[PDB]
Amino acid sequence: LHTQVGRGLLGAVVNPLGEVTDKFAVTDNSEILYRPVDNAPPLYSERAAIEKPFLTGIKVIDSLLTCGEGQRMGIFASAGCGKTFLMNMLIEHSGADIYVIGLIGERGREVTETVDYLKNSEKKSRCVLVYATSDYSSVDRCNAAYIATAIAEFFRTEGHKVALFIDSLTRYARALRDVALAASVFDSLPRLLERPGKLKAGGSITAFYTVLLEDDDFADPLAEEVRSILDGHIYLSRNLAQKGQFPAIDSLKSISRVFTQVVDEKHRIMAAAFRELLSEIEELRTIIDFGEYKPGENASQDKIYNKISVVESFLKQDYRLGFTYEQTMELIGETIR
């Protein structure tokens, strides 16, 4: 019912029972307090409208899928699509005050991977990790997502800009199913997913939920439902990954529904002009695969063809590099000229 919260948890790895099991960092603060894990969602009059962008340092996100402070974003991907590396980039290149990571994973390796990453991360002293392996019960796996959320909710009350990561919603929903077997999956899923947001009287929780996909990016009832509740979704396509494009974000099938609210007019114009260029490039790729493209026949197709290298270089991003908003808008400008 209750877990420990506070700045004393910064740098600590917390198990599904609320105790500190490991540390990836030591902090100056020893503040430890207790709040209930089943907190009520914010009332509608207590939430602030999402108007400020949540900068991620990833070019394709910040330019075409701009997140907002208080937004809940879904990340849809199959295995081997760089989901974890995109998570690391969001932690490493964004500018949040505090990062709270909740692993509803399976094997102890996956937990140690993030612990080893955090131990060499620059955001080390601002991160809290909550984990739940496959060895833990279905109740403990569910409580992990709740403990991580309650920890994030305290830092928001203190006024901090918090970024919450739940990996994954799929395994949380599975554990939540077996919970009800003993007695939307109940639904108890929207309760967890409507707790983030920016509060008028405090800070914000910008939440990223991962949803696992099967095969050719197949969205089972799990993925379609979650897609409807959140304020947008980033989708990592398996085919962009095998082509060597990282991050494997298919921007044409991804969206941030608060995009028009968090960027100005000149940004919106550039983003629309670039998305049209992406649509033109995909229309040429299928013409090329059909053997119907020969240079010099269509001046419009030739102009689009010579833009592929410029567009591909903008989309790709080394996971160790982060870009400012101004750099992104400057790069997106040179691409559509």
Q: Which two structure tokens, joined as six digits, stand for 132?
A: 């739940």
What is the longest distance spanned by two Cα atoms in the chain?
A: 71
**Known binding site for ATP: residues?**
80-85
Q: Which two structure tokens, joined as six digits, stand for 81?
A: 């699509």
Q: Which long-range contacts (C-beta less than 8 Å, at least 24 apart) are formed by 211-215?
A: 211/74, 211/75, 211/76, 211/77, 211/168, 211/169, 211/170, 212/77, 212/78, 212/79, 212/168, 212/170, 212/171, 213/76, 213/77, 213/78, 214/78, 215/78
List Cα–Cα distances, 16 to 84, 126, 147, 261, in angstroms. 21, 20, 7, 37
Q: Cite the beta strand spans of 118-203 per DSSP E.
A: 127-131, 161-167, 197-198
**Known binding site: residues?**
80-85
**∠ CA 38-87-139 to the nearest 5 degrees?**
30
Distance between CA atoms of residues 334 and 316, nearest Å: 15
Q: Which of 136, 130, 128, 86 is nearest to 107 (CA)?
A: 136
Cβ-contact 319, 246 below 8 angstroms = yes
Cβ-contact 202, 157 below 8 angstroms = yes
Count helices and strands in the chain by DSSP H and E runs: 13, 14
Task: Fill in the amino acid letter for 66.
Answer: T
Q: Which two structure tokens, joined as six digits, stand for 324?
A: 């400012």
Burial code (b: 16+ CB inside 10 Å, e: under 16) for 172-185 equals bbbbbeebeeeeeb
Residue 163: other Cβ atoms inside 10 A? 29
Q: Cite the beta strand spans of the chain per DSSP E.
A: 2-5, 12-14, 20-23, 33-36, 53-54, 67-68, 72-77, 98-103, 127-131, 161-167, 197-198, 204-212, 232-236, 255-256
Cβ-contact 54, 71 below 8 angstroms = yes
Strand partners, 12: 23
Residues contacting residue 290 through CB under 8 Å, at least 6 positions apart: none
Task: Fill in the amino acid letter for 262.
Answer: V
Distance between CA atoms of residues 111 and 131, nearest Å: 7
Cβ-contact 175, 141 below 8 angstroms = yes
